[PDB]
Design an enzyme around this catalytic site. Sequence first.
Site, PDB file in Angstrom:
ATOM      1  N   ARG A   1       0.843  -1.323  -0.150  1.00  0.00           N
ATOM      2  CA  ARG A   1       0.031  -0.053   0.049  1.00  0.00           C
ATOM      3  C   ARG A   1       0.867   1.173   0.036  1.00  0.00           C
ATOM      4  NH1 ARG A   1      -2.864  -3.200   3.897  1.00  0.00           N
ATOM      5  NH2 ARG A   1      -4.646  -4.293   2.945  1.00  0.00           N
TER       6      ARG A   1
ATOM      7  N   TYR B   1      -5.508   1.308 -12.104  1.00  0.00           N
ATOM      8  CA  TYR B   1      -5.330   0.615 -10.846  1.00  0.00           C
ATOM      9  C   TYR B   1      -4.378  -0.834 -10.900  1.00  0.00           C
ATOM     10  CZ  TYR B   1      -6.249  -2.490  -6.661  1.00  0.00           C
ATOM     11  OH  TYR B   1      -6.227  -3.303  -5.681  1.00  0.00           O
TER      12      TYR B   1
ATOM     13  N   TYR C   1       0.117  -1.407  -9.158  1.00  0.00           N
ATOM     14  CA  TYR C   1       0.570  -2.670  -8.409  1.00  0.00           C
ATOM     15  C   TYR C   1       1.577  -3.104  -9.146  1.00  0.00           C
ATOM     16  CZ  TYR C   1      -2.979  -1.259  -5.119  1.00  0.00           C
ATOM     17  OH  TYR C   1      -3.927  -0.512  -4.435  1.00  0.00           O
TER      18      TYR C   1
END
Lengths: 196, 211
Positions: free
Chosen positions: B56, B72, B76
């Site tokens: 995170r 999104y 990551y």
Amino acid sequence: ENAAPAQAPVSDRAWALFRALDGKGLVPDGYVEGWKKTFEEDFSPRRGAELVARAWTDPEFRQLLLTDGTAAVAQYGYLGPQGEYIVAVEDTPTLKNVIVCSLCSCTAWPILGLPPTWYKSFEYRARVVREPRKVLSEMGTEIASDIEIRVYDTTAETRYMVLPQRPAGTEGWSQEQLQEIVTKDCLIGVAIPQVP
Amino acid sequence: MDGVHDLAGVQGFGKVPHTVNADIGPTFHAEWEHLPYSLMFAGVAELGAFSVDEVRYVVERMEPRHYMMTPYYERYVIGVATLMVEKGILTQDELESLAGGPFPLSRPSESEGRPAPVETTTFEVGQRVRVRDEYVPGHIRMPAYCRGRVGTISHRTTEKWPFPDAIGHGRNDAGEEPTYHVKFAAEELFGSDTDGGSVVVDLFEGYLEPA
Ligand SMILES: [Fe+3]
Ligand SMILES: [Mg+2]
């Protein structure tokens, strides 16, 4: 000014990350494929729907789900990654619950499925905490003025599901029939179960 | 970290791109999209190289414009690659050689994190609490809309977890704390400029003080 950085195509970057790790022997055989299968086939809103239909026809389970959601989910074997501490929040005639992760995407993966693109959008992350009535309306769900809307921002390890109210016109339905009208969006809290 | 990722309450966005029960398509919309989560778990559980909290935070550390224009799952990819380089497992050079071109990463951390607070209180359901008026430049699981605000405890978790502000930096002093569902009136957070009722934030004990 404010231009994006130069970047290789995202597929090439993502597979480069895989290959760099896999070529050093750090990724077990079938490891990412195993996860893809878990994410696609095991984690599913059909599990949360099953839980809701059981709660709607079994008062004792309903009480367990609302006081110790983890233990309730465990009876079905649906605990998992991003769903180890579960809290179910109950809609009532004066309260509508809605779930978000304003800081990223936090979601009860095993019983809701991985979050959908819209839930991870900046629009939903910015807006539903401040104007949930307008957001739900735009999404097609009208919530009357004398219903309190309560937004749960998923900021730690609690992983939530909404227990929606059971709609009239479903009296005597079977758990199978009931589960069919409980959708993913019902579990997130942006939709209310619909009766034909 | 008061980063652009702390989006709750920001004004100016348009409609959520969804109407109820509309088709969301398949779980993954491209053949690479399962890689970021799967390689995150490889890093956490197989390599022991970092925590989910560190993922995170490294996503929070993307350059702010880069965050705002990146989809999104790509954030990551960038984040997990960044941690693999920072933890010494991979080099940026080999990522770029494999990728056939540039692979910019998240920015270096500007904070060492902080330990789990030594002095905290065990709160009970019903008690009034205030979110500590503190500014944390590293990772923190407190959205700024509730900093300094007062609410009521609706739940104390029956489990405990490492303090994010420490484990999100890979520190050895994250301890363990329960979290609290803290219910705020909408008016407490946004004054008149809200159409909501209440907001419940799940806050680590170390973020709270008696009101
Ligand atoms: Fe999240
Ligand atoms: Mg801010």
